[PDB]
Paper text:
To defend phage invasion, Bacillus subtilis utilizes [name] proteins to sense and recognize phage SPR tail tube protein (TTP), then unleashes [name] activity of its SIR2 domain to deplete the cell of NAD+ and abort phage propagation during infection. Structural analyses and biochemical studies reveal that [name] forms a tetramer with a SIR2 central core and two distinct conformations.
The cryo-EM structures of [name] from B. subtilis 29R were determined in its apo form at 2.92 Å and its complexed form with TTP and DSAD1 at 3.16 Å and 2.98 Å, respectively. The final models contain only partial tetramer including two complete protomers DSR2A and DSR2B, and two SIR2 domains of DSR2C-SIR2 and DSR2D-SIR2 due to its instability. In the structure, four N-terminal SIR2 domains form a central core consisting of two SIR2 dimers via a head-to-head arrangement with a buried interface area of ~1700 Å2. The complete protomer DSR2A and DSR2B form a scissors-like dimer with a total buried area of ~4000 Å2. Further conformational comparison indicates substantial difference between DSR2A/open and DSR2B/closed with a root mean square deviation (RMSD) of 2.800 Å. In addition, the small triangular protruding module of SIR2 domain has a conformational change with a rotation of ~20° and a translation of ~7 Å. The result indicates that [name] lacks the capacity to catalyze NAD+ hydrolysis alone, suggesting a potential self-inhibitory property of apo [name].
Author numbering:
A (entry chain B), C (entry chain A): 22 to 297
B (entry chain C): 12 to 335
Write the structure that this text describes.
Amino acid sequence: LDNNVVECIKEITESSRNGKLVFFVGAGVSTLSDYPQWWRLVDKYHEELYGSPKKGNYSSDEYLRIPQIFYNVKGEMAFDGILKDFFQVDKPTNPIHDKILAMNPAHVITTNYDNLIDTACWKRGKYFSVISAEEDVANATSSRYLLKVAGDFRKGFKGENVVLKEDDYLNYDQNYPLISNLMKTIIATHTIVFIGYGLGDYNINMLLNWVRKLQKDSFHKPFFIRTDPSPIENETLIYYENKGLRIIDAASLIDSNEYDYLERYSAVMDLLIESQ
Amino acid sequence: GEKLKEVFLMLDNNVVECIKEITESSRNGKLVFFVGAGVSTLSDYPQWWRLVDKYHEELYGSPKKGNYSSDEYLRIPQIFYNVKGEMAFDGILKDFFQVDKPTNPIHDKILAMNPAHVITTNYDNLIDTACWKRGKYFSVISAEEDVANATSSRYLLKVAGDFRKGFKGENVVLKEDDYLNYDQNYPLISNLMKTIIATHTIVFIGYGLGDYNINMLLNWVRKLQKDSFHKPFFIRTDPSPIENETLIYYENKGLRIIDAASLIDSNEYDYLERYSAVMDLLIESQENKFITKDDEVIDYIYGKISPLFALQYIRKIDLKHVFE
Amino acid sequence: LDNNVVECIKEITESSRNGKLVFFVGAGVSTLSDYPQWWRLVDKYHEELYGSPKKGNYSSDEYLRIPQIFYNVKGEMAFDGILKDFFQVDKPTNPIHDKILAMNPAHVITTNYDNLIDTACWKRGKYFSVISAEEDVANATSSRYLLKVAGDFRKGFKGENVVLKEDDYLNYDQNYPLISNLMKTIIATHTIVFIGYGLGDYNINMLLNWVRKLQKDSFHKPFFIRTDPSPIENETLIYYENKGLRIIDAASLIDSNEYDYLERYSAVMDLLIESQ
């Protein structure tokens, strides 16, 4: 019924019983809680600086520079008020945030700047530690960790706390030294399962650049959950298998429509859950 | 024809202070052009999207159905190299880049702007043929070994490799492995590029303000301290005019932009009209045709003769060298 | 007893009772156990390198290049045999190893390549996970780590395993990627107390550089135990209270002559043990 992923599940359920499994939760999970996807905000910086909305599919150059262009031109207070008006919203808890916590993970690292996984923790009662700035690594009060590597809005709705702009991705190891370093230790020691990302995200490939610098057979290979609608090519699967990743695709396990994300995330995860 | 003189009177104070400083550096011998893919495509040279249409179809069976995402567009020649080998990667490069295409009139206008060096990200041979037609020799540098074995101290610095040592893919940086190992594989091409920018006047031709080369060069400029470096010039040849908020953002990053859609009115596909309206506006400002003020003829004769007040007498056979 | 040494102890005991105290075992605790110091080894090369022994003193260049020349000229089997001739020893444990385990450390990180802290933990029953090479970072069996950051001779008495040559010290971020990460992850989440270095040791200068990359007040400032004969001057003390090394100086607490090393080490540790 399945091809070569039957060995992939058995290590995960072994990692679930051992308590050595860490999910790398992404925005593909958080977009399921009808949270504002980031392209809506870029349009708000677009339509205030250009004086008109985007007429079509804009260029990838101005996909990382319109958050920065509004930062350098319109200032800091105007950039901060828009982060209030688009992020001070209440979204409910997705089933996936129960399904991710159904496996009882070792740590939860995420690039999500919301509080949605920070809501399903205390609702289910699993006590984690929210580290999102540099002042929380040394004042960490628990061996279990919730690591928000892109910052969050706990200290307020300002631009100083969260990684959005272009400068915050380049000047990143020179700004978050212990959150970059705490992440690479977690990936070294515990088994990483990606969920909620494509095979072309900024945060996914920057890991695979690091994995090649490591020694061969020194790392346990990361798993990837692909929930894209179109199925992966046979040459694309071998390109990330020969770069560290072990892809578990949803488009080859179940048959769904082109807009059926929540049905795709559950079918992989319940296959992981029901084995345990 | 005479449109350029009535363009010139419609320039604002920003572009006039760009043309006065680009042309003062060509006269000093401190002008360097940084040539991109824009002047190569005006000679019909095979663009890199015509290659990435070959790989995705010899690696995925069928031609493309939809637009390339930036995730896919960067990584298709690496999937072809890893899966389908290294002799077939060099075969596709051999199939498309055996052309012997002509040099566009823009290759003539760059060299007629009398440069000291020409840096290029183009792996073509088009700029190197045009330099040898004229009576100046450029030491072509495309590998690591060519820097210490340099000859003439006027470099044609091909920072993206070249196919002079064969049609092999290990001599030209094209893939993504070649984009992240560039500082490791090319330590001396990078240092020689960054020293010319630090010591000369730079004009960028053939780019569009979002490029991997312009962005990795404005990151190096962010590391330099304030007011120690001359700001590079950037010629923009795009159909849409530049918006004012973008020209603020790139002037604070250290680019002095001359928009070509802001100087002339042209069609969306007439790229030689936009390239020649900025290059001819520099070339005809040096070959002094935009002097119709009758007190700009005073500080032109003064700027060439006020040195000669330190001497007592000057021969008249020497004054025909003062005025070139 | 001044308040500064008092305020050093009142944290370290509270870190030991909370299980967040990590000792950094250094070259001091092995020479008290009379393990062969490295300078007689660089003598042994310099008896076959230049052909004649040390008529005078050495230079800091020859302190760092005499091993490398022998491995290049005499070969690879001649270098490993000299390490074989001097390291087939069974030296006993000092009491200073026992004063380190007496505070119940959360981790023990050392740059010593001997098995002396291995045997000191085996006798007292403190089971740890020795990580010396890079195939042990992912294959670790526990969460209490015994991290040899300089390698160990468990695989063999060969020059490949242990960083001794000049090429071995410059390619440390390229031969030990994870251990260079696993060390700094422990420094941020614990209280680090150094034992067994001078102020100008090469391993201490590298840790003082990484703290400069860190932020202001984002880290708990580690503690240094300096056991030199002459007491440190108060001017030198202020220079390390901002670079990131609180100093408990052993010479300013008791009286001892110019060669009683084990007296100076035993004094400062009993102030820690009797406080708990």
